[PDB]
Design a protein around this ligand. Sequence first.
Ligand code: ATP
Ligand code: MG
Lengths: 99, 387, 151, 49, 292
Amino acid sequence: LAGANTIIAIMRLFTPQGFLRTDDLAIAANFPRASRNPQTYIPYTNQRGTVTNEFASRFRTIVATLANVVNERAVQDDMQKATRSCTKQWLRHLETQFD
Amino acid sequence: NIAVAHTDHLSVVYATMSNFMLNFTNNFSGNHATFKPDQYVITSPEGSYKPIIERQGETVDGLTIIDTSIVWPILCQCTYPLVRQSIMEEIVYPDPSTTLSQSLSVAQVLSKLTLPDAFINMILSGGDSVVMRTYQTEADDDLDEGIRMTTYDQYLSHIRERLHITNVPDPIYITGASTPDQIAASVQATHVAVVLYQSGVINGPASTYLRENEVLVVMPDYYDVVSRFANANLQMNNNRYHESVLEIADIFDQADFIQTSDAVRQLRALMPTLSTSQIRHAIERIAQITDVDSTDYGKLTLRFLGTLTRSLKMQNAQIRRIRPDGTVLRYDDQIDIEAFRWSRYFLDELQLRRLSVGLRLITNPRIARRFNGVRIMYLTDDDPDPD
Amino acid sequence: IDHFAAKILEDWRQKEKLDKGALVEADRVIQRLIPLSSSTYVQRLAAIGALYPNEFTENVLDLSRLSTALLQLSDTYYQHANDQLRRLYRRMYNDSRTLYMTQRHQELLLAQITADPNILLYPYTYIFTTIPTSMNYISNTGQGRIKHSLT
Amino acid sequence: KRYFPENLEQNQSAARLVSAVKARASEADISSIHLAIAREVSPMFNVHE
Amino acid sequence: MLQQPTGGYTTLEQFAFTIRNDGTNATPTQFLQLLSYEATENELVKKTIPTPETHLPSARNVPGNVYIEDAITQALFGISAQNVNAHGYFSRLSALALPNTSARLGLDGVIYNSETINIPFYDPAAVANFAATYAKLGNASTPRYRADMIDIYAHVGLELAGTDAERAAGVMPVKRAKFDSWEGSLISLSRDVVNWKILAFLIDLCSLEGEALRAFKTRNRDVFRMMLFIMSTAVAANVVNRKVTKRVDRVLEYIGVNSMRTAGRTATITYDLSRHEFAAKFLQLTFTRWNA
Ligand SMILES: Nc1ncnc2c1ncn2[C@@H]1O[C@H](COP(=O)(O)OP(=O)(O)OP(=O)(O)O)[C@@H](O)[C@H]1O
Ligand SMILES: [Mg+2]
């Protein structure tokens, strides 16, 4: 949307990192399934590289985006100015938890 | 009455303390209007940076709260060796040895403190990777052959920050108006072979260049990618590609940035898939194997410091100034000190020197005595040669 | 930045007076500073500063906020439609420690050396040829609405 | 728990942050955690809120 | 004593200069063939080199036999050398500068105070020629006599990267040198040069005259360029490698531009400030001899 880019860009953090998967085994087993073509969306896939994790890197760009968000936040109270920078540190620590 | 002592005595103590080993930063410039401390961080491409200065708010046993009231005792209820002169106190000229021996102890500790972490992260530096699809431009191409592609998201998460660390011009967008020679100029400017796609169909000579030269095109998304190329050959097709990993070592090749020796390549190939916790476990075991020597003052600083180090990723950690606005500046030859241009995996020059010899040792055929594969077969054992 | 700005202004006024061919008491032939170590922005000032761009003679820049204007000018020169001026500016930006001067300056340096053989002047220098530009901008800072007569 | 870097929980400026996080952080309970996992694949016959 | 041939000492097979490459002992020239250049927007324009000072530093009373060759080669291409100006034994070369001195420059690269048995040495006249210039390496450090460490490198570029046309013109584009390369190539090259008996090249560059000298300059141009290459890698701002279809091309940027950088790096041998003044003085002298 032409004027509200930052909103959409924040909204893209919510897009899933998994994949859509046909229920192959349930089809072969002839298990009941109301959908004409059965499938479920697995939230995440297996790590494929020896070191990098696509999921954790995703979260890294998410917390980076959010850190930019908190950074761009105007504040007037001094305490709010403080919790801004602390929020930034706590994000940067969540990143490592997630990793 | 106090001014004579503050000017003629305290000043040489500030002057002498300015030369001490560990007082490693500029404190001021004299301009209140403009002095902002230089703000280095230990950034890594695969993690958040640690600012060296932060409002971490820990009082360090009350070190960081500043009572201005302290000027009152100074002006009024304190005496000085110079002011007293009507008794003449002799001035004290303290031995170097006490602070030097301390400063050295600290330097000795914190020098080696990072070593096991440094070694492992030095090995794994080439191991970071991006998923990439290789579409085939022509018939009878091996699946490894063809134009190589990666999502913009992968270029952002890995390749771009490393371009910042390597301090090179940003790779050109290719609009399909682009000549192969322009792509060449870009790859020459940024030594990693990469070009962001922008828009429009890409002409065929450029495609043969992107194929022959193994340039990794950075497509924004994989939506009908064959529409993006002038597939005059008509061999390229959306269902016809081969996905695979691409290690950072398979793209970058800077020397003190990213270990890329065929030896370490091989050693990495032998490795099991790794989580960050497995790596931390490696580091802790390497640390436990070699209990580093330290002088008693060093054990004292160690226990004062004095615990975890594990919060910080050091995958390709570097030291870089951040702008106060919060962006991480590229290394600047005229501002930042030269020693920061590459953390050399935080190893000493001599360790790097020996390390090359050791890579010659590890890669040696004579010690490659773990054997893979076997052959079950039912023969007589008549004349036993192990060979 | 503010020092480099004032010096660039001084050398441009001086070179402008020299190019008109008037005899002038230049206290030093190249009035502008030579960064030895500086941030990027200073190197941009040094670059467009050494270009002696037509825009100053045309008063296209606003001198009230000089360095800003200078930074702005540099950007256009950084991506100039003229290949010559763009390659020239780029070159000056990558060799900021070198002093750049037109030939007509250099002869004055040689005269200054022939007069006092042991005079010290900056060792690292390059003699670029000035690139002509045909765009004769009208301009006038200062009050007064323009009363156009359209053709 | 691992919610806060040391020693940000102790920093005075962080109070308004720390309390906020503590307002959100439920204590762990396997029945609830497993339930959150299972709900992802179990069919929904009454619109969740 | 070794008699000097009609050509230089370099004509002897004893003094062959050959960097290791592709499993064989390559002559420097056939390594220089591997080099290729990416021209950039900048121009190198060579200024006239200032005449080296008349003064020859005193060779202070040293009882022992100074190993001059090893010192010069390590100040020039050493992987670990530093504070090359601190000892200041380069001045010792001056002891050879006198007529009829009892000092001898041995093939070992030692300066004996006295002629001694079973140690072959260069003809004292030619060595007096070589010392008559290169003793001035002894004042590479003294404030009155330091070389420019910025301008001289443009000459290096021309003598290394330059085409015959750019060379005759005296002005070439700044170039980014590159070559298909093996692991640790610059360190291996530089160590293969530290082993060179460069005093042979220097003594012939100083002693030979007339047409016989000129044939030296062509025959040994590539050697000079190899030393120049190790120096230019020592001052290059960065030495990237490029992946290209399972072949790696080492690339140093840039030839002919001293970056003054002094921080170490795995890729190439590094100059302390002292080695910058040393190499710059060495270049002033060596080019001053080279062009005549
Ligand atoms: N006027 C200029 N002169 C020389 N180099 C420039 C100039 N403008 C940009 N560059 C180079 O190109 C890059 C462009 O950076 P970018 O334009 O995003 O922000 P910037 O450096 O503040 O420039 P600008 O002020 O034009 O935004 C910089 O890293 C700089 O090295
Ligand atoms: Mg003045």
